[PDB]
């Protein structure tokens, strides 16, 4: 049973490196710091569609 | 009125033409490159994201 929780902590961090690194061109994703991003998809102001990164 | 010493439809066409050469040189130069932005005069902010890519 320890030795499976080897492995257990071991993908346990692995899911935190994914959060914490993932990122476009800098910008973290996965973390929660993304937070709600409006994009804005339109010829005239005002138009734009909230992604939600959680 | 008729006059020599002044073309301004020659400017006029002259001025086009270099509208359009100059358009004929930004294209031959992203076909040949394989990028439509070659330089921060083309979309600066497309090269800052484009190089952090």
Do not use: C, H, P
Not at chain 1, 1 to 25: C, M, Y
């Amino acid at each position: 049973r320890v030795a499976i929780q080897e492995e257990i902590t071991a993908l346990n961090d692995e899911l935190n490196r994914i959060a914490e690194t993932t990122s476009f061109g800098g910008n973290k994703l996965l973390n929660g710091t993304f937070s709600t991003k409006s994009f804005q998809i339109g010829a005239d102001n005002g138009e734009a569609v909230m992604l939600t990164l959680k | 009125a008729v006059n020599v010493n002044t073309n301004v439809a020659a400017m006029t066409a002259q001025r086009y033409l270099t509208g359009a050469t100059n358009a004929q040189q930004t294209s031959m130069e992203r076909l040949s490159s394989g990028f439509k932005i070659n330089s921060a005069k083309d979309d600066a902010a497309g090269l800052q994201i484009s190089n952090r890519l």
